[PDB]
């Protein structure tokens, strides 16, 4: 096994490239879907750099990414947005004010949820090292969605990232009581992100089904899995 410092540095270097996109209901959804597809390509590359991921069975790798992709997109959005109250920084040159959610049916509720969760991370003063850990924990199925060598390996990988998160928190020097509460709050926020993801995917599928936006390629493949 790697040390926790070694694991966190591995997560840092795995970070994906940033993407650039390029309103009506159609044009906002077109931008957002084009963005997601671009990010998804890079997400797969990112997952492959997480220690142990490519040692899992191909089926587990597929099922993990199918399960978490929207959560991973969303936590990245929250991190990009953390220091800008009332704004969602989807990408450079796609910075949306809360009120621009009025452009798309049903999207404002989702924006408000994403902004509220971002605000909780801001209040917690989420650290760089914590962000890295929690994004990897999401991929490695800290939610425990039902998907033996591969399952045993996955448990080991998830435990390793959790250990690294505990280590990061321990470096803050706050009381053991406060360290435990912080970990609880972070895990409960990840559970909340899962719920927002479920809502977001339902909304995307609705926009597809109503022919508000076409969905192609990798995003289509990941959406079809839901």
């Amino acid at each position: 096994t790697l040390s926790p410092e070694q694991l966190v540095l591995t997560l840092l270097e795995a970070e994906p490239p940033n993407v650039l996109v390029s309103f009506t209901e159609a044009s906002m959804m077109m931008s957002l879907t084009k963005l997601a597809d671009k990010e998804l390509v890079h997400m797969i590359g990112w997952a492959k750099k997480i220690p142990g991921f490519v040692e899992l069975s191909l089926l587990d790798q597929v099922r993990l990414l199918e399960s978490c992709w929207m959560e991973v997109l969303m936590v990245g959005l929250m991190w990009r947005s953390i220091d800008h109250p009332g704004k969602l920084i989807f990408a450079p040159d796609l910075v949306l004010d809360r009120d621009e959610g009025k452009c798309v049916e049903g999207i404002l509720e989702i924006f408000d949820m994403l902004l509220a969760t971002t605000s909780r991370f801001r209040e917690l003063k989420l650290q760089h090292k914590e962000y890295l850990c929690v994004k990897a924990m999401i991929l490695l199925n800290s939610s425990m969605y039902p998907l033996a060598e591969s399952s045993r390996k996955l448990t080991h990988l998830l435990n390793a990232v959790t250990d690294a998160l505990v280590w990061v928190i321990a470096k803050s020097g706050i009381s053991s009581q406060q360290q435990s509460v912080r970990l609880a709050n972070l895990l409960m926020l990840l559970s909340h992100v899962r719920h927002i993801s479920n809502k977001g995917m339902e909304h995307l599928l609705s926009m597809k089904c109503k022919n508000v936006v076409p969905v192609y390629d990798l995003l289509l493949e990941m959406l079809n899995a839901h």
Partner: peptide, 9 residues
């Protein structure tokens, strides 16, 4: 490229 091709690439 599809999910599988991206994973196997």
């Amino acid at each position: 490229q599809s999910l599988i091709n991206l994973l196997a690439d």
